[PDB]
A = this chain, B = another copy of it.
Amino acid sequence: GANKTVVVTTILESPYVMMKKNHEMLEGNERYEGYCVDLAAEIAKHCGFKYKLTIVGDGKYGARDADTKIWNGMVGELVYGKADIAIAPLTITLVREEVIDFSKPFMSLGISIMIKKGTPIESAEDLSKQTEIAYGTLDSGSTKEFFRRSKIAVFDKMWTYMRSAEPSVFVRTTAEGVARVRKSKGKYAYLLESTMNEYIEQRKPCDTMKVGGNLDSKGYGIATPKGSSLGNAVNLAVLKLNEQGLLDKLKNKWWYDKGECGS
């Protein structure tokens, strides 16, 4: 049959996808800006398709309910045929790979620690050995799941701490985690993807820091329904953009070129 407009699912999160300040004046894909908006356009240009940016209905990345077996988030939108491609900071994981197709990574990263400047923490081991400085993750997504599923002693100890700590150490959004770091006088540290940590470190009021090595090493991938023909072309596009240096330029544009915390 004839070509059809490709339905892209994504999620609103700076600096990946944001409504432009003047979005009310605009329409369609032009309402949005950010790293993933630019990446979507570069992929579509290379592959020769038209597309529509849509925002994932449930605000989630993708997990399977153990009782109902239903997939939520952007993964679910692909699994159930509601979108044709997901272009987002979506971590490549085994359980997701079993149900959807992923490109090779477009961005490499790991779980990391964000502190308020001056907090006496340098590593996950440091966090794990104490409770005065509380620490936690988002309440959904791959960072939380890393701790929940880990069999590594330090990370298992951290998960047991997080489930039992009071008040709750979990946050609903990145903005909430960052605000909690900023407002807690050194008594909250936030575990989050290194990408995001690096972005926030260059935002005013310039009071957060990434510390320590990353806890793991993984990647974000472009996702398509399992077996979709679009997958091959999108994957080749990711590889081409990487080989041309364009992914590095795009990260610099959205993270550093207009950083707010000096040179």
Contact = CB atoms under 8 A, between A and B. Distances in A.
Contact of A235 (B93, B97, B105, B217): B97
A229 to B, nearest CB: 14
Contact of A239 (B94, B236, B244): B94
Nearest to A94: B239
Interface residues of A, number: 27
A218 interface: yes
A23 interface: no
Nearest to A96: B239
Given A104-B105, A108-B108, A248 B217 contact: yes
Specify the main secondary structure of chain A where it touches its partner.
mixed
A240 B96 CA distance: 12
Contacts of A102: 104
A149 B245 CA distance: 12
Contact of A105 (B93, B105, B149, B244): B105
Given A102-B104, A104-B102, A94 B219 contact: no
A67 interface: no
A184 to B, nearest CB: 30
Interface in A83-124: 92-94, 97-98, 102, 104-105, 108
A33 to B, nearest CB: 24
B152 A239 contact: no
Contacts of A93: 239, 243
Nearest to A251: B217
A151 interface: yes
A92 B104 contact: yes
A97 B152 contact: no
Contact of A151 (B236, B239, B244): B244
15 contacts: A92-B239, A94-B239, A94-B243, A97-B236, A102-B104, A104-B104, A104-B219, A104-B221, A105-B105, A105-B219, A108-B108, A151-B244, A216-B242, A218-B242, A219-B219
- 6 smallest CB-CB distances across A and B, nearest first, come from A94-B239, A108-B108, A94-B240, A152-B245, A94-B236, A97-B239
Given A92-B239, A94-B236, 4 more contacts: A105-B105, A108-B108, A152-B245, A217-B247
